[PDB]
Amino acid sequence: GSFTMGAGGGGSAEQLDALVKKDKVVVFLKGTPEQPQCGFSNAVVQILRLHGVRDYAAYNVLDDPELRQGIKDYSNWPTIPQVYLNGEFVGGCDILLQMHQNGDLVEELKKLGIHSALLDE
């Protein structure tokens, strides 16, 4: 695969790099998958679970200020939900809503050896 993580630091890009390299489905919201923080937090988890993807790491960026400000700066954005696949940027919650429905997430999942459960319909 793509080799493992090992770095650390205070919200720094070299730490955020190792953070997206902790899983193949690293999800990122000001909140949790189990409680609606603010708008569009379930829209990412609906798309993932429909595709058969339920074992992501959902990162709450309110838990640590370094997660918060680290992801805001790394994205150059004030607020998102995101998902990174294989540590690569892949999109925020507005982008995911386009790519789901065109089917470009499905080819991205096939790079990892993951199978969209919309194939078995």
Tell me the domain boundaries of the chain: 15-112
Residue with tokens 């949790």: 32
Q: Is 49 annotated as a binding residue?
A: no
Q: Is 30 marked as binding a ligand?
A: yes
d(CA 46, CA 119): 16
Report d(CA 33, CA 74) in Å as an integer: 22
Q: Are 90 and 84 in contact (CB under 8 A)?
A: yes
CB 108 within 8 A of CB 96: no
Q: Is 71 annotated as a binding residue?
A: yes
Question: Is residue 95 marked as binding?
Answer: no
How many angstroms from the chain centroid is the CA of residue 38? Answer: 16
Q: What is the DSSP string of 43-101?
A: HHHHHHHHTT----EEEETTS-HHHHHHHHHHHT-SS--EEEETTEEEEEHHHHHHHHH
Q: State yes or no: 94 annotated in a binding site.
A: yes
State phi, psi for 65 to the nearest 5 degrees. Answer: -65, -30
- Mark residue 43 as left, alpha or beta (left: phi above 0; alpha: psi -120 to 50; beta: remaining): alpha
Pairing of strands 25-29, 57-60: parallel
45 class by beta-carbon count within 10 Å (0-12 exposed, 13-18 middle, 19+ buried): buried
On whether the CB atoms of residues 61 and 71 are closer than 8 A, the answer is yes
Whether residue 47 is annotated as binding a ligand: the answer is no
CATH level 3 topology of 15-112 = Glutaredoxin (3.40.30)
Residue type, 86: N
